[PDB]
Amino acid sequence: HMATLKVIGVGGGGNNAVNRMIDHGMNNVEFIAINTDGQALNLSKAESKIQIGEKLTRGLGAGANPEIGKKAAEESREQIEDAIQGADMVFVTSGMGGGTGTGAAPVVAKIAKEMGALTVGVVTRPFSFEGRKRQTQAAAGVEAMKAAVDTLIVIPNDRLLDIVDKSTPMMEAFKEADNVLRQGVQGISDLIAVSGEVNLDFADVKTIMSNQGSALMGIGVSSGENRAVEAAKKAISSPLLETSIVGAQGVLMNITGGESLSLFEAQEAADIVQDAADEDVNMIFGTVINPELQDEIVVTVIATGF
Numbered sequence: 001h002m003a004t005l006k007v008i009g010v011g012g013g014g015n016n017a018v019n020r021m022i023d024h025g026m027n028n029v030e031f032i033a034i035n036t037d038g039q040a041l042n043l044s045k046a047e048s049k050i051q052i053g054e055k056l057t058r059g060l061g062a063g064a065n066p067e068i069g070k071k072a073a074e075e076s077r078e079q080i081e082d083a084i085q086g087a088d089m090v091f092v093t094s095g096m097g098g099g100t101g102t103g104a105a106p107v108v109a110k111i112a113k114e115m116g117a118l119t120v121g122v123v124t125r126p127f128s129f130e131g132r133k134r135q136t137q138a139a140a141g142v143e144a145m146k147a148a149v150d151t152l153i154v155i156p157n158d159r160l161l162d163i164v165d166k167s168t169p170m171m172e173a174f175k176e177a178d179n180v181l182r183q184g185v186q187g188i189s190d191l192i193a194v195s196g197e198v199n200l201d202f203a204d205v206k207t208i209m210s211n212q213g214s215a216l217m218g219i220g221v222s223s224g225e226n227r228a229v230e231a232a233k234k235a236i237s238s239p240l241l242e243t244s245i246v247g248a249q250g251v252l253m254n255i256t257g258g259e260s261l262s263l264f265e266a267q268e269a270a271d272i273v274q275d276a277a278d279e280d281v282n283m284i285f286g287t288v289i290n291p292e293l294q295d296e297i298v299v300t301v302i303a304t305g306f
Ligand SMILES: Nc1nc2c(ncn2[C@@H]2O[C@H](COP(=O)(O)OP(=O)(O)O)[C@@H](O)[C@H]2O)c(=O)[nH]1
Pocket: 010, 011, 012, 013, 014, 016, 017, 061, 062, 063, 064, 094, 095, 096, 097, 098, 099, 100, 101, 102, 124, 125, 126, 127, 130, 134, 157, 174, 177
């Protein structure tokens, strides 16, 4: 079994994330670009492109109307099904609050879920500066996504205002939000590809993520003194995420280290995660020894069930 991973961008923001991932380079993941806007879709370098709602929009976008996004996806349901064929896991990425993402992404997610794919949504909420209507439409989108996916990661764009200085380029800030998705997809790909000393596989991912509501995914890297605790704290930190570690009922945790990785420090890291999570948490713990590493330790967490 080698799980087939697909990343599906829906609407402008979703496709922006996909494009930036394709530019970065990601092996053994299929990218699918879905949009109403044919002009934007033409510029994508995704190898699978689905223009939805041509009869409805005439190749334009949804004009920020979620009803148009929804009806567009429904018009093109068979083409979406065809593109998803074979997927074992689907990441649906979209900016909530517009028309295409808000309306179409839940339709796409439901199609993926009903084909049996582990279906993870990774969506943004609008900046407060975009106004109340955008925020209200986005909230309806988030609720529709929750109903359609196995697990949902929400990135409030307002959180980007917490990680910039007054001069940080907007595109650099956007790359930080895109990195949430990138790290999660890369992380799952790495888990499926590599045999661990205490091995985690796709069935473990499914146990933690299938039908499990909100999710946090995180990665932390450290070295030197107190490296395990520092890496674990970085992994569970969620400056950009709506959902924090507190009260998690399911956790997939991995530690990657060199040959120096100690039992004591593995316990230290796991204890950091446990102290935060629910008393009856289903923790699935893994470890990898990468002898190419010297003093680096990597802690990764997927936390669900809130
Ligand atoms: N972080 C981030 N948010 C975006 C990006 N593009 C759009 N957004 C957000 O996504 C929302 C919907 O925009 P968009 O996806 O272009 O609309 P749609 O094509 O009608 O789905 C906007 O209101 C923004 O909050 C992006 O590249 N990065």
